[PDB]
Amino acid sequence: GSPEKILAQIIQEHREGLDWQEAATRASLSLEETRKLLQSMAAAGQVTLLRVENDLYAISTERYQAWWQAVTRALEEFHSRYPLRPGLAREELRSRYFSRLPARVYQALLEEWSREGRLQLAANTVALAGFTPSF
Ligand SMILES: [Cl-]
Ligand SMILES: [Cl-]
Ligand SMILES: [Cl-]
Ligand SMILES: [Cl-]
Ligand code: NA
Ligand code: NA
């Protein structure tokens, strides 16, 4: 198939996403070409781009959106069941839905969702934005 189809399949099939350089290598593409294709896939709403430390990851947008829907439901349910607790253990959420991700990528996702106003983070726990303990 064409180089663009090869790259698209690499990213869309990848269950955690991957360093864009790794994707370039797997597709036998230059960085230039990989970047330009990623920019059009991002414009089409197909790929999510995430900096992780000094690396850049390309992730299927469908996968990323499905992660968020799992997280918000789990936290909604947790806050309903246990409204006095400050949040769910970060490591428990990781083990539920993110066990194949590198830990640093999981942390970058939590920090992104917090920045966006979706979450609030403590050192060990995670909660929905605006949640406060009560009875
Ligand atoms: Cl990778
Ligand atoms: Cl290159
Ligand atoms: Cl989302
Ligand atoms: Cl996983
Ligand atoms: Na992004
Ligand atoms: Na790097």
What ranges do the domains of the chain cover? 1-60, 61-129
Task: Say how far apart CA 41 and CA 79 lie, in whole Å.
Answer: 36
Q: Which residues pair with 60 in a beta bridge?
A: 47
The structure was resolved to a resolution in Å of: 1.1
Residue among 49, 71, 70, 73 nearest 61 (CA):
49
The rounded Å distance from CA 83 to ligand 1 centre is 38
Give me the CATH code for the 1-60 domain, please. 1.10.10.10
Q: Out of 1.20.1250.20, 1.10.10.10, 3.40.50.2300, 3.40.50.1820, which CATH number does the structure's domain 61-129 have?
A: 1.10.10.10
The rounded Å distance from CA 134 to ligand 5 centre is 34
The rounded Å distance from CA 87 to ligand 6 centre is 33
Coil/strand/helix, residue 127: strand
Ligand in nearest proximity to the CA of 48: 5
Query: How many of the other CB atoms lie within 10 Å of CB of 81?
Result: 8
Half-sphere exposure of 47 (CA within 13 A, CB side): 29
